[PDB]
Amino acid sequence: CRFRVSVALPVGAVVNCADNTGAKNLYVISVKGYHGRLNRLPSAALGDMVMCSVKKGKPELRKKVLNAVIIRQRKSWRRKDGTVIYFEDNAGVIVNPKGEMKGSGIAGPVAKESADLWPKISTHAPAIV
Amino acid sequence: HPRHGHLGFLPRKRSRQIRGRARAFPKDDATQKPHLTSFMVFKAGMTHIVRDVDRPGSKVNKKEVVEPVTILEAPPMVIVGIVGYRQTPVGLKTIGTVWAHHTSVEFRRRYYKNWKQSAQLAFSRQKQFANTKEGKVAEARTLNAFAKKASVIRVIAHTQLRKLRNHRVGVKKAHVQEIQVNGGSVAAKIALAKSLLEKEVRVDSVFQQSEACDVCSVTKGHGTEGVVKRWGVACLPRKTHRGLRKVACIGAWHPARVMYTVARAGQHGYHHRTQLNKKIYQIGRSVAVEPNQATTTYDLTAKTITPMGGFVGYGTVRNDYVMLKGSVSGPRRRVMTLRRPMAPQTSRQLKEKIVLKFIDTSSKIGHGRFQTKKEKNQWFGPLKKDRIRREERLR
Amino acid sequence: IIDARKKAAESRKNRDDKRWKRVLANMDEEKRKKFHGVRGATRASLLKRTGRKPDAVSMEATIHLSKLLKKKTFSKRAPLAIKRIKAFVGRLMKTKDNRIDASLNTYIWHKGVKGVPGRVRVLIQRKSEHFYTVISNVPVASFKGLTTKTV
Amino acid sequence: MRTIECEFSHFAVHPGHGRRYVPFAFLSTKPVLTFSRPKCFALYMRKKNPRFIPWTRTYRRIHR
RNA sequence: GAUCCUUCGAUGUCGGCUCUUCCUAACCUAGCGGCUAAGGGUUGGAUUGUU
RNA sequence: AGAAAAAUCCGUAAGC
RNA sequence: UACGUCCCUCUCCAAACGAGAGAACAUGCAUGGGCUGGCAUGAGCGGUGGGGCUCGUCCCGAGGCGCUGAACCUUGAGGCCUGCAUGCUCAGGGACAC
RNA sequence: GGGAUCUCGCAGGUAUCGUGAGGGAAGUAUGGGGUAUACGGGAACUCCCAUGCCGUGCCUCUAGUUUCUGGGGUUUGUCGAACGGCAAGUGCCCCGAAGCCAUCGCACGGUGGUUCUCGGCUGAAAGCCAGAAGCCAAUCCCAAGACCAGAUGCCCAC
RNA sequence: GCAAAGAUCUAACGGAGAUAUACUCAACAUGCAACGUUGGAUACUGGAGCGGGGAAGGAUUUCGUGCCAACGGCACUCGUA
Ligand SMILES: [K+]
Ligand SMILES: [Mg+2]
Ligand SMILES: [Mg+2]
Ligand SMILES: [Mg+2]
Ligand SMILES: [Mg+2]
Ligand SMILES: [Mg+2]
Ligand SMILES: [Mg+2]
Ligand SMILES: [Mg+2]
Ligand SMILES: [Mg+2]
Ligand SMILES: [Mg+2]
Ligand code: NA
Ligand code: NA
Ligand code: NA
Ligand code: NA
Ligand code: NA
């Protein structure tokens, strides 16, 4: 799928929502594809699908479990060509279980590591960086 | 949970030697031609390179990557003896050894604890007797014994420490080791060994540019260490009487003793390891013969392999060197052994051919932003010291 | 015995310069030369061996103190400096009786117990009565360009 | 590879050195900024002007 | 449950945390046509002192 | 008192 | 008796103490110079400054400008250069072997 | 030849390179590509590419750490002032080498025999094939109280 | 084990408390460690003080000259001994 990205967002983190669905927060509940290990919290990185919940936003999508994709992170990661890069904030986008993106626009830039895995997001991305 | 650590690397005790020693040699194939299987080098330091990857069906294929490397300095080696072994129902037993006619002061220094304040009598009777007529008879008898009742041939080689003009490596007595001869029949092995007696061999006659190798070396020492850093167990909660950095339960009531599988405190570091499959990226010649060592086809800058300000704690690299991908066990200045690989070498990665595009030679002190002294001068200009020196020279 | 060690075998092996003169003068260039291309052991050549030095000598030296005191305890920095200076001068003069002058004590202690300066210039005077030394302070504006001298 | 100039000091950044940064209010022309050492990033975040810092290329160009 | 053999000039009591080892009547992984196989694995949280 | 030794030279438990 | 080994002395790839790797007139140690890096423009002096004080001048004044990528630091639990310069060593001492 | 009122003393010492009995022992899991159609919606092996955990290291880069109190800045007191500093158990703030260190960075993690469940071939049970596991050996770590008559340098003794 | 209450350094006098050798030998590698007084340096207490006077309690601990066996949990040439 992709190379390695340093894990950034353990369970319990709150990240911004970059879509235009009315949500303002996302609360990380778990990470898809995590195999367990004793005492270790599951953590997410770019291009991951997470189970989330809205903590502040429109009341019609609030007290339930949803899916989201991470597109930005403050923790820096190293690319194969030896460049270290990081963003200014953590962000996410609400999607389908199959990857189709609820909403029709994205606010800031998105990372190539997450635009490669999800082709529907890269269509609405305003810049791939 | 799985257990902490590997029980196949016990006892975690200090090594018996400081040099790396090959416990086994690659299997002998009589179809090939006779050759040597080992070499001793000295660790200098680390840097990184840039390289374009040829790996079909990869997300990095046809793209550039940055890979760290380690530099090991390899002056030539001198052969001084031949040994043979015979197989017995209880193991290999050595038959005898055939010494060269002349040895060097640095080889004979290895037999003394205080060479300068001594009579320096080593190998004198041997030299006289070898010159005499019965000495030739004895040598011929030993060589015939090899040719008739041997299965393994090894040569005795040593390092030339006066060729390696290093100020931080303090030792003046040579390091001695046995290198096996592989390939061919026993007669052919003996012929090659006799041809290489009192002669110097180079690392490029043993290894080629894009092959792989194994490394035998001794790890960096750390002294007595506790269980948290020695074995990797978990710390205990802040609210703990008598300390947090311990193992809580060291056994059950029965058996009524401590088992060998439980973590205790003691020596960490200074162990021997063999480190399979280190791909070699470049074999460089001496800076006397070729002064443009770190120059490539893509980068035409004239530079050597030593960084600005020198390798930290080691100095300048003055002889031939080997560039290995990754890391090796041990600190700088330690002697190491390079061995021909034992594992199969049929992987695409192990068969790829390497072409370097860039080699970093910036300073390892602080953050380096200049590749060369000419570049540093170009950035700055004439400084106040330069102006006053020119003025003083004028007047 | 020493005369059999020095010269003799060593001076005979210094015939390699005649061998190197013939080889180099044969129109050879860029030849890898190691042995005597020379004599080696600059301690052997340079040392003139002027002689067993007098009983009364005077020297002027700089001591780099900040390399002897590094990450030492702040409460012990200055007593440690006194001990280090004593040992330095003792190893230089082969004496066991080294006396610190009032000027040197004041200079070492004049910024308190942790503010010991980073360099000091001293004057050493060896005397016989049994041998001992007296060490005093030489005030200087700067330490650049100053090497060990005899006075 | 390629050599890039530091965003603050215009130092040269060679392959394998430095850190890169993407701000939220990003420029379309320059979405990613390169810094050569943490000192430069500290000054940039403090919002200092490079022409008043005597060891930067812009200051040297203005004065010298 | 029954019993009352040892211990009443005393063998520190539930749960959790930490750490090692062993078993099989096999949850996963591995082979067969239900059988073989104990080699390597077997998670993180809300309420409750809990199991 | 027990050898995973041996039984002009060198080379053949041979012609040597 | 001899070969030699150990202690004292020096170095740090080793190190709780033992043990280890080394050297034993050796660029070995010391100081200085050059390099490589760190901080960010020294002391002192001098003709732009919101204002103010006295006879076009003469003074009080935070800050600024110039000399000035200056000044200082850089191996030390131990960065580089003598395949850069000087200074110190002047029969090493003791115990075993015996 | 000395000791004590018989006794040994009459022989090894030092320094290298090796052997290897015996003991320890380790790698494991998920996904994709291709096949990529066969069968009548939906396969499989060879082979390629990543990742999780575990293990053994390393310090080029990035991150953490500063009693190099390194350079600068700043508060109260204090030496008549400037300079130099000093006290506030490291006054406090910014940047900071070397060293240590992080699944917060980077590198590496091999081969053969034997048997069982079972499938066979001859053949009246027996003889012979293939054969997931597992087991044994090797690679890897310690290694002569495993008392090596293994090899070798120098001195002494006979 | 003798780790709260930050900390001492230097010279000259004093003292048996030393510069204490079989010799060779300039000296170091064969007499170590520790004490009092005076001068100088560096710190601490910091006026709710390791400042200057009293009650209760103690009863010669006060002062000078000596001494250093025991006691002052290390030491003393010094002591409320
Ligand atoms: K075994
Ligand atoms: Mg009952
Ligand atoms: Mg060390
Ligand atoms: Mg004790
Ligand atoms: Mg104590
Ligand atoms: Mg206590
Ligand atoms: Mg005070
Ligand atoms: Mg108060
Ligand atoms: Mg007492
Ligand atoms: Mg009195
Ligand atoms: Na837990
Ligand atoms: Na407690
Ligand atoms: Na004070
Ligand atoms: Na201070
Ligand atoms: Na105290």
Q: Among B72, B73, B17, B39, which Cα is nearest to B218's?
A: B17
Structure tokens given for B205? 């006659």
**DSSP H/E element including B60:** none
The 3-state secondary structure of chain C reads: CHHHHHHHHHHHHCCHHHHHHHHHCCCCCCCCCCCCCCCCCHHHHHCCCCCCCCCCCEEEEEEECCCCCCCCCHHHHHHHHHHHHHHHHHHHHCCCCEEECHHHHHHHHCCCCCCCCCEEEEEEEEEECCEEEEEEECCCCCCCCCCCEEC
Experimental method: cryo-EM
* DSSP summary character for residue B315: B
| Cβ proximity of B375 and B314 under 8 Å | no
Residues 6+ apart with CB under 8 A from B387: none
* DSSP summary character for residue B227: H
SS3 state of residue B300 = coil
Cis peptide leading into B75, omega within 30 of 0? no
Resolution in A: 2.9
Placement of tokens 């635009």 in the chain: A115
User: Amino acid identity of C149?
Assistant: K
SS3 state of residue B347 = coil
D47 CA to centre of own chain: 12
Structure tokens given for B122? 């080593």
| Cβ proximity of B360 and D14 under 8 Å | yes
Residue C14 phi, psi dihedral angles, 5° rounding: -75, 15
SS3 state of residue A19 = coil
Nucleotides of E under 7 A from a protein CB: 17-21, 40-45
Separation of A14 CA from ligand 11 center, angstroms?
22
| Cβ proximity of C38 and C13 under 8 Å | no
| Cβ proximity of B37 and B29 under 8 Å | no
SS3 state of residue D46 = helix
Whole-number Å distance between alpha carbons of A128 and A47: 13
Whole-number Å distance between alpha carbons of B245 and B255: 25
B157 beta partners: B79, B177
Structure tokens given for B222? 């750390």
Task: State whether the beta carbon of B8 lies below 7 angstroms from any atom of strand E.
Answer: no
B278 beta partners: B213
Placement of tokens 């923790």 in the chain: A75
Q: Chains C vs D: touching, with 3+ CB pairs under 8 Å?
A: no
Spell out a b/e string for B115-133, using b for 16 or more CB atoms within 10 Å of the CB, else e. beeeeeebbeeeeeebeee
Q: Which residues in chain D have Cβ-Cβ distances shorter than 8 Å to A108?
A: 24, 26
Structure tokens given for B124? 């004198």
D4 beta partners: D13
Whole-number Å distance between alpha carbons of C90 and B126: 48
Q: Among B216, B200, B15, B215, which Cα is nearest to B107's?
A: B200
Nucleotide nearest residue C52, measured CA to C1' = G90
**Alpha-carbon torsion (B309, B311, B313, B316), positive or negative:** negative
Q: Which residue is nearest to nucleotide H59 (CA to C1')?
A: B46
Residue B36 phi, psi dihedral angles, 5° rounding: -90, 155
Q: Among D14, D17, A81, which Cα is nearest to B52's?
A: A81
Whole-number Å distance between alpha carbons of D3 and B290: 27
Whole-number Å distance between alpha carbons of C100 and C86: 8
Whole-number Å distance between alpha carbons of B314 and B334: 10
A39 is in an annotated binding site: yes
Nucleotides of G under 7 A from a protein CB: 2-6, 10-11, 13-16, 20-28, 30-41, 66, 68-83, 85-92
Residues 6+ apart with CB under 8 A from B349: B55, B279
Residues 6+ apart with CB under 8 A from A55: A14, A25, A26, A27
SS3 state of residue A61 = helix
Helix intervals (H) in D15-56? 38-46
Q: Could B163 and C34 be called an inter-chain contact, meaning their C-beta atoms sit closer than 8 Å?
A: yes
Structure tokens given for D28? 């379309």
Nucleotide nearest residue B45, measured CA to C1' = H60
SS3 state of residue B166 = coil
C150 CA to centre of own chain: 12
SS3 state of residue A121 = helix
Mutate to test the interface with D, among A80, A83, A88 (most CBs of D within 10 A): A83
Q: Could B65 and A80 be called an inter-chain contact, meaning their C-beta atoms sit closer than 8 Å?
A: yes
Spell out a b/e string for A70-98, using b for 16 or more CB atoms within 10 Å of the CB, else e. bbbbeebbeeeebbebbbeebbbbbbeee
SS3 state of residue A98 = coil
Ligand nearest to C-alpha B8: 1
Structure tokens given for B129? 């007797």
| Cβ proximity of A66 and A76 under 8 Å | no
Task: State whether the beta carbon of C100 lies below 7 angstroms from any atom of strand I.
Answer: yes
Nucleotide nearest residue B274, measured CA to C1' = H140
Structure tokens given for B243? 């300390």
Whole-number Å distance between alpha carbons of B170 and B334: 11
**Alpha-carbon torsion (C111, C117, C121, C127), positive or negative:** positive
Whole-number Å distance between alpha carbons of A112 and B376: 36
SS3 state of residue D29 = coil
Residues 6+ apart with CB under 8 A from A67: A49, A50, A51, A52, A94, A95, A96, A97
Count Cβ atoms below 10 Å from residue A32 Cβ, excluding itself.
12
Task: State whether the beta carbon of C94 lies below 7 angstroms from any atom of strand I.
Answer: yes
User: Amino acid identity of B299?
Assistant: D
Q: Among B311, B289, B313, B291, which Cα is nearest to B303's?
A: B291
Chains touching chain B through at least 3 C-beta pairs below 8 angstroms are A, C, D
Q: Using a CB–CB cutoff of 8 Å, tell me whether B66 touches chain D.
A: yes
Residue C149, CA atoms < 13 Å, CB-side half-sphere: 9
Whole-number Å distance between alpha carbons of B202 and C94: 49
Q: Which residues in chain B have Cβ-Cβ distances shorter than 8 Å to C34?
A: 162-163
Q: Using a CB–CB cutoff of 8 Å, tell me whether B37 touches chain D.
A: no
| Cβ proximity of B43 and B311 under 8 Å | no
Structure tokens given for C40? 């080696």
Of D1, D15, D31, the CB nearest to A127: D31
Separation of B58 CA from ligand 6 center, angstroms?
66
Q: Among A74, A50, A62, which Cα is nearest to A24's?
A: A62
Count Cβ atoms below 10 Å from residue A15 Cβ, excluding itself.
24
CA distance B354 to chain D (A): 16
Residues 6+ apart with CB under 8 A from B353: B54, B210
C102 CA to centre of own chain: 25
Of A2, A38, A81, the CB nearest to B66: A81
| Cβ proximity of B160 and B106 under 8 Å | yes
Whole-number Å distance between alpha carbons of B253 and A42: 36
Residues 6+ apart with CB under 8 A from A53: A26, A27, A29, A62, A63, A64, A65, A66
Taking CA B106 as the corner, what is the angle to CA B103 and CA B109, rounded to the nearest 5 degrees? 100
| Cβ proximity of D37 and D30 under 8 Å | no
Count Cβ atoms below 10 Å from residue B24 Cβ, excluding itself.
9
Placement of tokens 């194939």 in the chain: B29
SS3 state of residue A60 = helix
**DSSP H/E element including B201:** strand B200-201
Classify residue B356 as left (phi > 0), alpha (psi -120 to 50) or beta.
Answer: beta
CA dist B345 to B29, B31, B213, B341, B352, Å? 16, 18, 10, 8, 11
Task: State whether the beta carbon of C92 lies below 7 angstroms from any atom of strand G.
Answer: yes
Q: Which residues in chain D have Cβ-Cβ distances shorter than 8 Å to A84?
A: 18-20
User: Amino acid identity of A40?
Assistant: R
Give the B:D interface size as CB pairs under 8 Å: 28
Q: Could A82 and B63 be called an inter-chain contact, meaning their C-beta atoms sit closer than 8 Å?
A: no
Of B64, B66, B369, the CB nearest to D36: B369
| Termini Cα distance of chain B | 80
Structure tokens given for C101? 């002058």
